[PDB]
Write a protein that binds this ligand. Sequence first.
Ligand SMILES: [Mg+2]
Ligand code: NA
Ligand code: NA
Lengths: 211, 210
Amino acid sequence: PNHPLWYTLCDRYGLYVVDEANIETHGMVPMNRLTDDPRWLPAMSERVTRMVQRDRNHPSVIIWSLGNESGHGANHDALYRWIKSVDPSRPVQYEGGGADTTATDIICPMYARVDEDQPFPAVPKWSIKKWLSLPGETRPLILCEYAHAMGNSLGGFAKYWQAFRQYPRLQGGFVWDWVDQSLIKYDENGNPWSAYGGDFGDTPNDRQFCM
Amino acid sequence: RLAVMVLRWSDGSYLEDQDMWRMSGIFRDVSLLHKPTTQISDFHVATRFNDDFSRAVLEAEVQMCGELRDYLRVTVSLWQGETQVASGTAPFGGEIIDERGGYADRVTLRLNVENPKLWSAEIPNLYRAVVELHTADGTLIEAEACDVGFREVRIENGLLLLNGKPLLIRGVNRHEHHPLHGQVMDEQTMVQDILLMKQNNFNAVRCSHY
Ligand SMILES: [Mg+2]
Ligand code: NA
Ligand code: NA
């Protein structure tokens, strides 16, 4: 959840908002170790329920998200249904556990390609055109993350937009991401420079992957 | 002496506008068939399966015309080469279907078949079903027969399945055409076509358009 003023500004200037619970357990092995554990359900529930209680009156918020990169656990299913019960006015989405689980109203993959399949075990990233028509699948597809804009990037961006325009159920996506997470440091002359992972003696780190 | 007057054009021509040579005549086989007065007038063969296709039921519905009597029976026997794998005998008189009763001139035979050899384009396993119309005391009136292929075709969850597996149709449309004989088909030409089709990795044909 963002600073409260953000939603007011989105209401007034006009932007659609996905409001996302503060739950990410990416570093767990496997990713759902905590989110499938009922002992962590109370802690997770508060991050979802208190978000909805705070932000539910904002017209800019059109979709609720259960968080990010936390695999798919039974706690997600429970909280998906809680939201659907208290606020039928907004779809609920969640990418974890393969982007098309029972905890999401929208197929919402991250970095699924336009034409090329990436058949990872358990959590494949299908071609987005292919994904829509998998046997029994009916949901819309909106990428929660695509076109990773790291450094000299966005090659093939036009391929996504051609597909979005051609396929009714491909309804767009969210570019990753808006702004480089670089920090300012100062040299011996006091002159500022842009710093990334490792530049503060932080270790382990992931270097320029924050930009 | 037979006399046959064949018209090139008829009201039927309005339903025969296929993209092909427009020809006419007696262009398929002519035959003479003798049937007994009491006869098999229709029969349908169905094969249903359990979940893993390890058990099947062959259901044969048989209809008669002519002299309906209590001594009448139908025997359906199922053969795998020279081996009889299943057989059933019953008198006529189907189940009650409405307020007026049932079909006294019909019978449905149900044969259990364990571990049936399944039919596909890949392995065209066939059985022979013989349908015998006979008196209970053993007089064959007449017999009809067909090749039986144990297979299920169904669409499930958006997929066309054959024996539970999704097909990939390597198909071709085929008109009945011969450069010398026109629309007359012969066994040799049909076999030549089928051999060439299979040799070129086709597994399916559409009867375009008849
Ligand atoms: Mg035509
Ligand atoms: Na679209
Ligand atoms: Na990053």
